[PDB]
Amino acid sequence: AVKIRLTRLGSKRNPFYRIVVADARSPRDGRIIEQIGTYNPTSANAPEIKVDEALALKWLNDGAKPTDTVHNILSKEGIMKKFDEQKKA
Template identity: 60%
Template sequence: MPVKIRLQRHGSKKRPFYFIVVADARSPRDGKFIQKLGTYNPLTVPATIQLDRQKALDWLHKGAQPTDTVRKILSFKGVLYLKHLLRGVKLGLFDETAAMEKFQAWHSEHETQIKKKQEEHARDRRVRRAPIRNGGGE
């Protein structure tokens, strides 16, 4: 049975909200699924992603194939990087503690970048919504 990790659309028209699910590749987009891994809301800046990393990693190890969009989401959340590091552990390139240290360093840097992007977006929104005041004299 071919298994995919894909998005399942919810939400109303022009207001998408997605569940990240593991489903049989032959089932319809919004049909039956095996397990729910998280949620994805593309309307926020940056997009809000709630994901159970361990479940996603387990399914990737079992051979589930992510769709293109889900692959980008897993990459953004670091699941694919963690899988890469664990493969290095399996091959004996380094031990598991070194792999987790590398992942934690990457994760902390990634979180600071996300916070920076959120602050920039909030500042831009404040600037756009601020009333334009006439300097006078004209």
């Protein structure tokens, strides 16, 4: 379906993911629906989680699914933890 993924950047052996929620029928670096935020877990300490969680309230409620690695940083950073009450509507 339409789903959040990990679309990367950066030079050799160094990724810079900006997340994208888009269809699974596209390639991993293909044309998108929405580039929400970035996620650079590859640092010395931080995962550098920048998130604009306002639009997960839309797409996860009418068709978008978190998928098995983009699902559990939301359970880690707390993006879906705010959605936990927002899914409790």
